[PDB]
Structures are given as structure tokens and as C-alpha cells.
Write a protein that binds this ligand. Structure first.
Ligand SMILES: NC(=[NH2+])NCCC[C@H](N)C(=O)O
Length: 212
């Protein structure tokens, strides 16, 4: 709080490849739900918003080393992450789905249908964590969902595992892709802050409570 207020700018870490929460528009702005949340936290602090964009798997370590104040980046509240960092009250529900090529005959519905397929994930996500739990799935890991889909679209992967909302976002803009599966997990995004910064966390929950 008072390091942020001193410096006049709240540093947000995210990965701008995840509509409709964080993505790059036609003008090269990071826009969408998570950015608006950030704007409304910064606005309430009287500081300005500095968006730091980086790969997803860079967020926790960035935050643990003070390069950022918060992670607002469609980040699922996991017990495993809850061990190193602290989370806000939940701000959105989502779950893993499987996106395939609408061409293909292949319509997986469960993770077991992906066994002996090549599956594209974003390193360090809950999709990555979860497909990695089934043997036989040949998991190929990408820094960016952009390149995970590119590769599906080429033919070099049989599917992409990611959150429901973003899947819908990516599918709306690639009519050669379809979501084959229903929702395969039950996740809730939170806003990640260091465990010491409890007066920041409480502020975020006050703002979060005030928006809803
Ligand atoms: N680039 C992103 N914003 N990815 C969101 C990650 C998806 C999921 N909520 C997770 O925490 O692993």
C-alpha cells in the first residue's frame, strides 16, 4: 500500500494472451476484464496503472521478487499456489475444456480421450498441471496460447486444454476450431498478492466487494 502510494503506480503482472481477461487490441493496448479490475484498484489508490506483460509461468516468481505488486491474470486459486502467495476473494468461475479442429473426426469429451494424442497446453497452468496427470497424453508446452492454437490449426497437435471462457474467446475468432468437451474442472480466479501484504489484500477485497 504505502510503497505503492509513495511511488504513484501499482505494478500489475499479467499475460496478455487470455481474452476476455487480458489481450492486445488493434492499437497495441492491453485491454479487457482483468485490466478494468486493475484500473479500478489503481483508481481507488489514487495511483496510476502500469501493466507489466510477461509469460504466465513468470508471474509468481516476478511477484515473489517484488517486480510486481499483484497478479491480475486469470489466475486460478490453487492450494499449491496458496502455499507461496495469497489470493483475493474469488472473482470469476471457469474450468478446463478441450478445443479441437472442427475438420477432424476427433471429439474428445474426457481427459482419457486424450491418451495417445498430442495436446497443447500453456506451461504452468491448471490445464498443463492436469493433462500432465494422465499417462499417454503427449503434452507439448507453450509460453503463449497464441502459439498453442497456431499449432492446433496447423495439425501438429490434436487439441488444446485451457479455461472455458478463453476457449470460447479463441473459438469465436477461429471458425475452424470447436470446443468438443464439456467443462472438466471447477476453478475460481483470484488476485495474487504477497503473503506479507495483508493491508493490500484487504484493500483488494474491499474494492472487489464494492464492484459487485
Ligand atoms: N495467460 C493467462 N492469463 N492464463 C490463465 C491461466 C489459466 C488458469 N486460471 C491458471 O491459473 O492456470
Amino acid at each position: 500500500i504505502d510503497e505503492i502510494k509513495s511511488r504513484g503506480y501499482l505494478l500489475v503482472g499479467l499475460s496478455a494472451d487470455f481474452p476476455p481477461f487480458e489481450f492486445v487490441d488493434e492499437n497495441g493496448n492491453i485491454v479487457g476484464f482483468d485490466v478494468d479490475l486493475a484500473k479500478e484498484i489503481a483508481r481507488r489508490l489514487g495511483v496510476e496503472l502500469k501493466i507489466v506483460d510477461m509469460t504466465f509461468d513468470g508471474l509468481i516468481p516476478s511477484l515473489l521478487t517484488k517486480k510486481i505488486d499483484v497478479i491480475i491474470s486469470g489466475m486460478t486459486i490453487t492450494e499449491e499456489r496458496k502455499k507461496v502467495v495469497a489470493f483475493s476473494d474469488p472473482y470469476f468461475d471457469a474450468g478446463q475444456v478441450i478445443v479441437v479442429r472442427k475438420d477432424s473426426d476427433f471429439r474428445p469429451k474426457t481427459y482419457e480421450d486424450l491418451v495417445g494424442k498430442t495436446v497443447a497446453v500453456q506451461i504452468g497452468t491448471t490445464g498443463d498441471i492436469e493433462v500432465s496427470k494422465y499417462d499417454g497424453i503427449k503434452v507439448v508446452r507453450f509460453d503463449k496460447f497464441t502459439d498453442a492454437f497456431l499449432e492446433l490449426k496447423r495439425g501438429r497437435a490434436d487439441a488444446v486444454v485451457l479455461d472455458s471462457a478463453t476457449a470460447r474467446a479463441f473459438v469465436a475468432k477461429n471458425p475452424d476450431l470447436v470446443i468438443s468437451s464439456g467443462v472438466l474442472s471447477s476453478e475460481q480466479y483470484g488476485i495474487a498478492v504477497r503473503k506479507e501484504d495483508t493491508d493490500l489484500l484487504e484493500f483488494i477485497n474491499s474494492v472487489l466487494r464494492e464492484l459487485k
